[PDB]
Ligand binder design. Structure first.
Ligand SMILES: OCCCOCCOCCOCCOCCOCCOCCOCCOCCOCCOCCOCCOCCOCCOCCOCCO
Lengths: 13, 13, 13, 13, 13, 13
């Protein structure tokens, strides 16, 4: 999976 | 499956 | 079921 | 491997 | 840089 | 003493 982020916020891709 | 994070702080998604 | 972490400092959630 | 980012947004390359 | 661990508990190095 | 890490790469400390 890894992550997706906008600025400082990251959640599972 | 995975974490939610804000900068360095991560908790279960 | 998961951790809560600041960087790699983690404890059970 | 790693991340592509444009402006504030990053996701898996 | 990086983190020092004993077992699963880690602090900034 | 235990182990030390940078990223995914770690070793004794
Ligand atoms: O493994 C060794 C053995 C360990 O043993 C004992 C410990 O065990 C304990 C249980 O383990 C569970 C570990 O904790 C779960 C943590 O979640 C996974 C973290 O994965 C990524 C690793 O690199 C990052 C380190 O920063 C962490 C921040 O998280 C962000 C989520 O990742 C996205 C990438 O973050 C890089 C961020 O950007 C660039 C850098 O600037 C920060 C700004 O972020 C902006 C975003 O942009 C993205 C662009 O890169």
């Amino acid at each position: 999976e890894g992550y997706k982020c906008v600025x400082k916020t990251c959640m599972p891709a």
